[PDB]
Nucleic acid binder design. Sequence first.
DNA 1: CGGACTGCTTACC
DNA 2: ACTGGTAAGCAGTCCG
Length: 757
Amino acid sequence: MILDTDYITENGKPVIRVFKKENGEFKIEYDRTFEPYFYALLKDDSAIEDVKKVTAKRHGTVVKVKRAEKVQKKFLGRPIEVWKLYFNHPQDVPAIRDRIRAHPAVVDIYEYDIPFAKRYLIDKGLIPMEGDEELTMLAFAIATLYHEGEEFGTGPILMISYADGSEARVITWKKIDLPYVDVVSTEKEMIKRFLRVVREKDPDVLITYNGDNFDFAYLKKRCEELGIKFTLGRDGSEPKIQRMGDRFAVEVKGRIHFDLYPVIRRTINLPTYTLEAVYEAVFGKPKEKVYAEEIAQAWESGEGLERVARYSMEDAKVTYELGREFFPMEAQLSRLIGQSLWDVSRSSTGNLVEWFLLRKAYKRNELAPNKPDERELARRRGGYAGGYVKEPERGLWDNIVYLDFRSLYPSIIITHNVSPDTLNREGCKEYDVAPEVGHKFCKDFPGFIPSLLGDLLEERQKIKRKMKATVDPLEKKLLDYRQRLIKILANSFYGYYGYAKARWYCKECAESVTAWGREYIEMVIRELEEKFGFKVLYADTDGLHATIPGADAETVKKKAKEFLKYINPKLPGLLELEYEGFYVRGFFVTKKKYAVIDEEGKITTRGLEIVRRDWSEIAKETQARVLEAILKHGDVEEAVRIVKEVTEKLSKYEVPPEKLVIHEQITRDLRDYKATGPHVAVAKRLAARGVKIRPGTVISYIVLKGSGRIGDRAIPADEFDPTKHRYDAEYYIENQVLPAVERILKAFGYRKEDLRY
DNA sequence: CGGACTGCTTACC
DNA sequence: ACTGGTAAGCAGTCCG
Ligand SMILES: [Ca+2]
Ligand SMILES: [Ca+2]
C-alpha cells in the first residue's frame, strides 16, 4: 500500500518520494524522472519565444521556462490547444506565474496551484491505501502543569502516555508506584525515553486527540526550551507544523499522524468534544476527567499522583481504541478521493470533491478551471431558490406513511445531464429546459459531473452486491465504509455546484437541480391529494408525511403502496418515489419541528429543542418526557404533572448544575462580532485572562441569579461554585423549561402560566 | 417608556 | 466554509 508522497531537493533537482509498505516492510521509492508543468493560452501560437523571454526573480538564484510544448486538451468539453510550460524546480512555478500571466500575449494561466507531491499522484494514476497490509499504530497523549493565561510552553510536561495493541504505559519524572508507570530522572529524560519508545516500536501511524493544535506544538516548545532533537520521523526528521487556515496541522515525515479531533468533530454531533464525551458517545463506557487544579495540587503535593497517572494512561488507551475504530473508514476515503489519509482526514467536502474532480479530469484530458479571484468570488455572491417546505397541518394525527424520492438531487443531475459543460451549448439535437430557472441542458454527450456521478452510483451497487457475498465480517465492514462514503460524495456534488470557492462552480446548475426538485415533490403531493384521498400533513424538499384521516393502519399502508405503483412510472429517468416508514401516531409543530412514534414504540424527533445542542439538558430532558407523555402514552395530564414537578425542583434549587449548562460555538474572530450574546460576553471576559477562545471553540456557561442582561450573569460551567453564587431559577423556568414544554402542550389548549410552580 | 419591531446569531433539516 | 429554508431568543431598535 502507498502511504503518502513528498519531494526532497537532491543537489538542485527535485526527487519525488513514494512512501509505501509492501511485503510487511516499509520502503521509500524515489523518482527524479517527474518534472513540474503548468498550462498557458497565447493569442497567437507563433509568439511562444517572446513569452518564454519572461524570467522571474526568486530568493534562490533566477528561474525561466525549462521547456514548452503545444498540448491538444479540452475545456468544458470544447477543445482548446495550450502551451504546457515545464519548470526546473516546482518552487519556481508560483514565482514566474503572476508575470507569465499578466503578459498581454498570454490570455490566462491554468493548473498553477496544484502541489507537486499531490500532482505526481494524480498523473501517475497511483492510489493511496490499496491492498491488504497490517499497519502498526501508536497512540500518545500528554499532561501539562497549566496555569491561567501563561505563554503556551511555560508549563513543563508532567507525564507522556502511549498505547498500542499490546499495552499502554506512562513516562513521568515523579515517583508513582504503579506497574504501567515509568519514572525518569528529569523532564528532558522523560521525553528522551518517549522518543526511544516510538523509534524502538517503529509504528506506521501516530494517533492523537487534537495533536495538530496542542500535543505536538507543546512538545516542540518544550524540546526547544530544553534543547532536544525532537526526532520522531523514520528519516530522523523533526515534525513539520504546516498551517491550515484558522488552525495548524502536523506532519511526521515517514509516519501517518492521524488526529481524531477533526474527524470526530466533523462526523459526530455532540455538545462538548472532550475525549471523555466521545468515548461514551462511541463505546458507551464512562471516563473520568482529572482536571488541571487536581493535576497541579498532585504534582505540588506528591499526594494523589496515582490518580493523575490512571488518567494519563486511559487518555492514550481511549485515543488508541478511537483511532483503531475510525482509521479504517478514513483509509477507504484515502482510496476513494485519491489523496493521502493525512490530507483527506483534515479536508472539507468541498476539497475532497475538488480533489476527486482534478484526478478524474486528468484521466479525461479536461483542463481544470482555476479557483476564483478575490474580485470573481464577490462576482458570484448571489443566492437562489432552495427546496419546497410545506407549512405543516399542526396537531396529533394517527397512521402516517412517510414517502421520499431515492437520492433526488443526484437522480436529477444524471437524468437531466446537469453539468457546467452541458449548460446552454451551441446546436445540440436534444435539450432539457429546467422548469423555473429556464436554463437548457444538452443531451447529446454525457456531461463531466453527471458521467462521474453515474459511475459512483453504478459502483455503489457493485459494492453492496460484493457485501451480501463476502463471508469475512472484516471485509463486510470495509466494503460497507466504501459504499456509505460513495453515497456521501454523490450527494455532495449539488452543494459543490453552489460553492463560490469551488473550481467547477455553476450557479445555473445548482438553481436548476433545486428547481426540478420543487416541480417533482409538488406534483407528487398534488397527485397524492387529488388522485388518492390522502392529506399531506408535512413535506420538506424531497419527502412527505401523509395519511387518510379516518382510515386504519392497514388501509393507509395498502393505499400508500398502491400510490407508488401508480406514480413511479409517470416520473422521468432515475426519479423514483419510495415508502420509507409507517408511524402509529405523529406530532407536527412548525416547519423543521415534529416527532413520530413507530409501531414498535421508538419516538423519532426532528428540530425540537430535545435535538438542539444550544438548550439546557433540563429543558431538553423535560420536553423529551412531556413529549413521550403525549405520544408513547396518551396522558396529556402526565405531561402537565411532569412540567409542574421540573418547575418546583428548579424553584427549590434541587436541580443539579450539570443539567443547566448551555453550549454555544464561537463562529468567527471575537472582535468581528456585531451584537453580543451571553456566549460572546463569556468569550470576551475569558479572552482578557488569555484563554484561547478561537473559532470552533464551544462556550459552556451557566446563568447566575440577578436581573438585567442574561449575558452579564453568565459564568463558565467549569467556574460554578454552589456555596459562593447560586443559579437563576427564573431563567431556567421562563426562558428554557416552560417554553420547550409549551411548544408541545400549546396544541392541547394549555397556557404557560398554568405549568409554573 | 413599556411595548412592539427589527437584526444578529446559532444550530437544525 | 457544500446548499437554501427555517425556528427561536437576545438585546438592542423605533414611537407615542
Ligand atoms: Ca424522517
Ligand atoms: Ca431516500
